[PDB]
Design a protein around this ligand. Structure first.
Ligand code: CLA
Ligand code: CLA
Ligand code: CLA
Ligand SMILES: CC1=C(C#C/C(C)=C/C=C/C(C)=C/C=C/C=C(C)/C=C/C=C(C)/C=C/[C@@]23O[C@]2(C)C[C@@H](O)CC3(C)C)C(C)(C)C[C@H](O)C1
Lengths: 56, 49
């Protein structure tokens, strides 16, 4: 059984991936993180209270 | 309109009303765009008109 699961682990490491590789951008917040201006959601007549800086 | 006929008077009134309605809409849009609020143009040109 030890050899069987050793082979299974080798096959797993060869053919399996930890994550699907989705773009990290979809995980980053848009609203409330201080980076709202990046998305240009409210460009026409932007709201002054929202900071212009995109540093977060 | 002193010498005009009824058809001419009705046509004059039609012209007056068309001009008046177009002018009312024109003033509405003029003030709307002069307040800013010109989104179609903003989006089309990619810049604030
Ligand atoms: C005389 C009437 C008139 C004229 C000639 C124009 C002309 C123009 N307008 Mg518009 N506009 C008008 C009235 C008018 N407007 C009105 C009343 C409003 C709402 C207050 C607007 C709001 C508006 C905006 C927000 C913007 C323009 C802009 C423009 C330009 C591009 C066209 C566009 O998509 O805008 C038209 C947009 C509209 C929302 C028009 C709405 C028209 C209403 C619903 C009246 C409909 C009447 C109907 C057809 C009557 C029925 C008749 C039928 C039974 C025979 C152009 C120079 C753009 C511009 O110049 O940006 C710098 C722009 O961004 N206009
Ligand atoms: C595209 C829009 C349009 C159209 C189709 C017409 C059509 C007409 N206008 Mg005009 N008119 C317009 C815009 C328009 N007008 C505008 C924006 C104004 C404000 C300056 C006027 C002011 C106006 C007056 C004061 C008179 C007419 C008259 C007339 C009629 C005779 C033609 C004439 O004298 O024109 C040439 C004269 C003009 C002022 C039109 C050019 C205006 C430019 C584009 C601004 C005709 C039904 C006359 C009529 O028959 O009244 C009973 C008339 O007395 N119009
Ligand atoms: C005839 C139709 C109509 C009317 C009456 C209005 C009216 C208004 N629009 Mg506009 N708007 C229209 C069509 C119209 N819109 C269309 C079709 C679009 C394209 C999607 C827009 C897009 C638009 C945007 C993006 C915005 C407005 C906004 C406004 C305000 C403009 C304030 C100003 O200075 O007006 C000038 C004075 C007058 C129009 C006279 C007052 C008339 C009313 C009835 C009282 C007001 C509530 C602003 C707002 O506050 O929205 C919440 C704004 O940011 N409008
Ligand atoms: C998807 C897309 C875009 C888009 C879009 C779309 C779908 C835009 C739509 C715009 C729209 C829907 C605009 C209406 C205008 C109506 C007007 C001017 C009416 C005038 C009416 C007038 C002057 C009427 C006059 C009269 O009736 C009077 C008063 C009396 C009558 O006896 C006689 C007549 C008939 C003469 C962006 C945002 C542009 C860029 C982006 O990148 C991609």
């Amino acid at each position: 059984k030890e050899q069987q699961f050793a082979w299974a682990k080798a096959y797993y490491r060869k053919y399996n991936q930890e994550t699907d590789g989705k773009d990290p951008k979809y995980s980053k917040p848009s609203t409330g993180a201080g980076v709202f201006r990046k998305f240009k959601i409210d460009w026409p007549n932007p709201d002054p209270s929202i900071p212009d800086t995109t540093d977060g | 309109t002193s010498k005009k006929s009824k058809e001419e008077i009705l046509e004059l009134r039609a012209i007056e009303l068309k001009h008046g309605r177009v002018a009312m809409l024109a003033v509405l849009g003029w003030f709307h765009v002069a307040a800013g609020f010109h989104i179609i143009g903003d989006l089309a040109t990619g810049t604030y008109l």
